[PDB]
Amino acid sequence: MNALILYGTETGNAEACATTISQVLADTVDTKVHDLADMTPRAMLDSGADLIVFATATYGEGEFAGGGAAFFETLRETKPDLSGLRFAVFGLGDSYYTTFNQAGATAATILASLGGTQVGDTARHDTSSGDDPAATAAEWAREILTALATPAV
Numbered sequence: 001m002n003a004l005i006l007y008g009t010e011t012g013n014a015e016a017c018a019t020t021i022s023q024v025l026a027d028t029v030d031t032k033v034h035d036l037a038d039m040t041p042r043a044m045l046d047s048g049a050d051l052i053v054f055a056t057a058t059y060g061e062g063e064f065a066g067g068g069a070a071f072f073e074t075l076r077e078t079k080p081d082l083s084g085l086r087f088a089v090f091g092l093g094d095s096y097y098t099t100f101n102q103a104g105a106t107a108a109t110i111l112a113s114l115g116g117t118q119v120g121d122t123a124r125h126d127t128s129s130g131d132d133p134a135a136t137a138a139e140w141a142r143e144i145l146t147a148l149a150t151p152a153v
């Protein structure tokens, strides 16, 4: 299995999370990290990666941070088949705000609707918890490894 770890950020937290996730996953799956500001659905598909991990912050009206907004709009507009892919979502947000962690929820909805298969839970990192996002992402990445190793029965 090989993975792409894609981040949507404004102030750098999601970037740090993508990097930490990549280092945790690397002994089990080959990984590459990219900013959503420089990735598209077509380039994602072109890579041939079969696990796509998203680290996405929320801003505005529950919108994707950074490059995520245009990336997910291209998915909505073009609706490519993602049935060949597994995905996982690490959301960043802050319960100080309304639309708490809505970007991660929206990503999981859209990706599954196109046939992607989710691995693990959608994380909801909360800045108001005081926990460091990248540390939380590292712990979540171990949960994803456990999920990948877990059978139906």
Ligand SMILES: Cc1cc2nc3c(=O)[nH]c(=O)nc-3n(C[C@H](O)[C@H](O)[C@H](O)COP(=O)(O)O)c2cc1C
Pocket (backbone or CB within 6 Å): 008, 009, 010, 011, 012, 013, 014, 015, 057, 058, 059, 060, 061, 062, 063, 065, 092, 093, 094, 095, 097, 098, 099, 100, 101, 102, 127, 133
């Ligand atoms: C102006 C502003 C609006 C925000 N809006 C939301 C929001 O709607 N929902 C949410 O859960 N977090 C919201 N956040 C919190 C950010 O998603 C959070 O700080 C996150 O860690 C930022 O990640 P980044 O550094 O990758 O941009 C907002 C933050 C700011 C500064």
